[PDB]
């Protein structure tokens with residue numbers, strides 16, 4: 580029944596709204612000026628960064644920004660975990676599998692959602708109260724510059740797909756419910772849940788994007804792209820935590836990364 | 841391990 584599939588899409592959309600404060604729609608309203616609110620403070624260099632500390636925040640610059648990125652990631656992992664628990668069937672899974680699904684899925688989700696807050700010139704930060712330029716971020720002394728730029732590369736391509744928050748809610752749920760994550764104990768219930776989510780996604784894209792018949796197939800590909808970009812991200816992280824003497828990695832990130840074979 | 845993720849999940 581399609582009605583069941585549409586009600587599921589709607590349920591996920593409503594949960595998505597409750598879990599993620601700054602949506603792509605709200606992100607775009609800010610980036611376009613549609614909102615009469617105070618525009619976001621623009622951080623384009625070391626100087627502007629210093630000036631906007633009190634507007635984005637409620638050691639050298641490179642490490643300073645890397646640290647900030649970790650804090651956002653920690654916060655996103657909590658929001659993503661909350662959204663995951665709202666996915667029908669998720670909390671009824673074995674606890675150990677819930678953790679595994681999160682361990683391997685959160686960062687692919689972070690990459691996906693970061694796209695909603697970016698354009699070719701920069702990324703919205705601090706719930707849209709700040710905007711840091713891509714040029715400033717990629718100029719950061721290596722290996723930090725190369726740490727940032729990859730997210731933007733993905734976003735520019737992903738954004739060309741023109742998904743909205745409604746499409747994203749299901750896309751994200753499908754990713755979280757991947758039954759091929761290393762170490763899963765009860766794969767069948769996960770795959771059953773994902774197969775239904777996939778049908779919901781396919782219907783969603785067919786109704787919401789009638790003019791783009793290839794969107795479903797392209798998103799399935801993005802899912803595989805995200806794993807590759809994640810592996811590279813993890814590797815890129817390994818080098819930083821062992822070459823940068825003063826690199827405290829947040830406890831949550833350590834947990835996630837530890838033994839991510 | 842994953843004590844934090846466990847906490848968040850049963851939260």
Ligand SMILES: COc1cc(O)c2c(c1C(=O)NCc1cc(CCCC(=O)O)cc3ccccc13)OC1=CC(O)=C(C(C)=O)C(=O)[C@]12C
Pocket residue numbers: 635636637643644646647648649650651652693702703704705709711716726727728730731816832
């Ligand atoms: C340029 O990014 C940021 C710069 C930045 O200055 C900050 C960011 C981000 C931010 O939103 N981070 C998102 C983000 C996260 C990761 C993941 C890296 C860590 C990991 O998950 O392994 C990679 C990215 C690449 C490009 C753009 C944004 C990326 O979010 C922040 C959180 C804080 O609590 C801060 C504080 C209190 O100092 C910051 O200082 C903020 C305001």
